[model samples]
Target: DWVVAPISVPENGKGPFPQRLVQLKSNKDRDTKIFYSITGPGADSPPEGVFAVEKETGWLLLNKPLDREEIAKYELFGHAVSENGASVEDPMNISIIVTDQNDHKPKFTQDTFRGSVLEGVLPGTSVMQVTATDEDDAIYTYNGVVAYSIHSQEPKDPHDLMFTIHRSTGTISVISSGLDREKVPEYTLTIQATDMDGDGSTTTAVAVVEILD
Candidate 1:
C-alpha cells in the first residue's frame, strides 16, 4: 500500500482531479477492451477524500492531505479489475506519487537603507548596512544569516566596488578603496541583501549608495 507523501497537493483542490489520458494500443483493440475506475480516499469510489485518477492512463493522483496542521499523509492504493465478461483474474497494481509543493511567500526586512564611502578608505571598511528577512517560516528553514551581492553595476570591476558583506550579520563593509567625490564625482551602487535559508524560498532587498567627498 503506497501512500501519498505529506506535501504533494496541487495549487487548487476544489474541482475534479485531472483524469489520466493514455491511448490503448493492442492488435485486438476491440476484442477485449479494458476500462479503469478509481477507488479509495478522494477517488471516484471514496468517502470524499483527496484522491483522483485518469480513465485512459490508469494514473492515480493524490491531491489532498498536504502539509497542514492535521492532515499530512494521503494513502491511496488498490487494484484495477477488468470486465471481460468471463472468468479471468484481470488485476493490476496502482502507483500513486506525492511530490512536494512550493507554497511560500518571501519578504524583505524594510523598504531600503542608505550608506556612503569616503575618497580614501580601505578595502574592508563599513560602506553601509544591508540586511533582509524571510517570511517562509514553515518551508524556508535556514534564515539564520544574511547574504550581500552587487547587481547591474555601471563598469563592473574591482575599482567600482570596495565593500564586503558580513556572512553572519549581513553588514556591508567598505574596504581599501576610498571615494574621490571629484575624479569619479559620485558612485552609485545597486546592493542587494538576501537570506541564506536553503529552502528554495529566498528573498532580496536593495539599497542605493551616495558617495560624498
Candidate 2:
C-alpha cells in the first residue's frame, strides 16, 4: 500500500544538468530493492528525455529548461518495482505545472504599416491604429501589458508637431490643421510598443501616412 506524492516544479530554472525533482520513498522489507520508472510526455514517450528517474535511487529529475508558453503543464506516470520484477506499488499519476515568467518580449504583427487621411483635416481626427502582441499573461500584471506611443515623426518641415499618437491605443491623429496633399504628400512616423507598462521590452515599426486628395 505504498503511494508517492505529486510533485511541482516551477519553470525557468537554471541548472547544472539533471536537476533533481523529488525522491520517491516507500517503506518496505529490506529484501525489496526498489526500482523507479516514469512514462508519458517528456519521458519514455513523445517529447522524450525531458524527465527521468533513477532506478536505484527513485529520484526524479528534469533534464532541460521549460517554457510555459510552449506548454503550461505536463502529466506523467511513475511506478516502483522490486528486484524480482514484480510491481511493489500502484502507478502514481504525477502532474508538473510550468509557471509563467516575464521572459518574452512584445512583438509587432507587421514590420511596416500604411495609413491615410484626407488632405486638410481638423485636430483630433483619427487616422489609423496599430497593434502589437505579447505572449505573457497580460491579464494578471505588467508582464505582458502593452502600451503604444509615437517614437518619432519625419519631415519636420514647418514643425515637428504634424501628428500625434494615442499613448494607449496606438491611434495616429492630426494635431494641427492646414494640411495640403500638394504641399506635403506624405509623412513618416516611427511607432513604438512597450511591454510591462512602458518599462520592459520594446519593439518598433514604421508607419507611413499618405494623403488622399
Candidate 3:
C-alpha cells in the first residue's frame, strides 16, 4: 500500500486560489469528453460551492478560500464520468489540508491588562501574569507563538531597574526589594505582545501596576 500526501493550502485569503488543483484523467481517451466534479464537506455539504470542475477538461478548481482555524482540513471526493453515460470509475478521495499562514497578529485579551504588587514584596516577586492570543497555527506550527515584554515603564525609580518581565510566561516581577508605594503610587507598563516568537507581528497594550500600600 502506497502512502499519499494530502493537498495543503495556506489559511490566508486565497492569493493562491480560484486556482487549479489537479486534472482527472481516464485511461480510455476514446470514451469522449469526461465530466468532473467533487462532493464532500466544502463541495456539496454544509459549506457548498467552494469547489468546481471543468466538465470538458476535468480540471479541478478551488473557487473560494477557507480558514485553518475553523476548518483545517477538507475531505473531498473527486468524480469523473463519460459525457455520454454520466457514470464511470468510482470517485477518489482527496484530502485537502489547510496549512497555517502568518495572517493574524497577536491580540491582547483586554484593552488594559491590570496587576498589583504589594509594597515591600520580596525581590523577584511575581506581580501578575499577562497574555495574548493569535489566530494563527499555535500547536505544532509556531506561526501563532507569542512572546511578551515590557516596552517601557513610567515613574522611574531613583535606584533604577524597578521591574522586569518574563518573555515566555508573561510574568512581571519586581527587579529588587524596596518598593515604597509612597515614592510612586503606581507604575504603568507598556506591554508588547509579539507573535511568531518576536519575529512576525507585534501588538501593544497598557498594563496598570498599582503598588498597594
Candidate 4:
C-alpha cells in the first residue's frame, strides 16, 4: 500500500513557489502502477486550483499564490488507486499550513496632505494626522502592523527640524519653535509608512504645512 505524507506550503512571494508537496510511493509492489488525486477545501472546492497532483508520478504540487490572512490552512485528502480500478492504499489526509510573509507594501490614503498652524506655536503642538494602510495580517501581528516616520524635509534653508511624526499613531507635531511666516512660510515634509512593525515594506507621502499669521 502507498502512503502519502502531510504537506505545508508557505504564503506566496516568499520563494520556492510552485512548491512540491509530497512524492507518493508504494512499498508493497514495486511494479504496481499508482495514480494520485487530491480533493478538499483548497483542491476541488471553493478555493480551487491551489493544489494538484500528477496522476502518474503521484507528485503533489502547489502552483498558486497563498494568502494566510484569507485562509490560514487547508485540509486535503490524497487517494491512490491501482491500474485495475482497485484501491491501492487508504485515503491519506494531508494538511497544508500557509506561513506568513511580508509581501504587501504599505499605502498612504492620500498622496498629498495639507495643514495650517498659527505662527509661533509651541513645540509638540499637533499639526495633522497622516495615515497609511497595510493588508497583511492584523494590527497586533507584526506582518500587518504599520508604523510612520519622517523621511525627509524640503527647503532646509533655516532649519530642518520643523516637525516630528509619531511612529505608531501617524500624528505630526511641531518640533521647533520660531515658525516665522516671513522666514519660512511653509514646510514640505515626506512621510514614510512601513508595515511589519517598521521592518517590512514601506511607502511615502507628502504633507504640506502652512504657517499662518
Which candidate should be chosen as best, given TM-score against the real structure? Answer: 3
Q: In candidate 4, what are the lDDT values of residues 64-147, reduced to their tens digit? A: 778887998898888877787877677788888777776778889999989989987899999999989887777436877898
**TM-scores of all predicted structures:** 0.43, 0.86, 0.87, 0.70
What's the lDDT for residue 61 in model 2?
89
Output the worst ten-in-a-row residue range by lDDT, candidate 3.
Answer: 1-10
How do the residues 1-213 of candidate 3 rate in per-residue lDDT, one tens digit apiece?
111247777666646567887776665546567777778988889788777777777777788776787888888887767768776667778888888888789999887888898897888899988889998988878889999988888867745457888998889898876678888888888899998898888899988989997
Task: Give each model's whole-structure lDDT.
Answer: 0.48, 0.82, 0.80, 0.82
lDDT of 2 by residue, 1-213 (tens): 345566666668887778988877656636688888999998998788989998888888899988878877889888888888988777888788777778988888898889999976778899988888889877756878888988888776556867888877778888887677888888888889898979998899988999889
- Deviation of model 1 at 100, angstroms: 12
What order do you get sorting by lDDT, best first? 2, 4, 3, 1
Judge candidate 3 against the unseen true structure and give its global Cα lDDT, from 0 to 1. Answer: 0.80
Q: List the residue pairs that clash in candidate 4.
A: none
**Which of candidates 1 and 2 is the stronger one according to TM-score?**
2
Task: Output the lDDT of residue 138, model 3.
Answer: 82
Model 3 quality (TM-score):
0.87
lDDT of 1 at 43: 53
User: Could you tell me which 10 consecutive residues in candidate 2 have the lowest summed lDDT?
Assistant: 1-10
- Writing each residue's lDDT as its tens digit, candidate 1 over 129-211 gives 66665432335334433455655343433475555566546677765454566655444455554444433434555665666
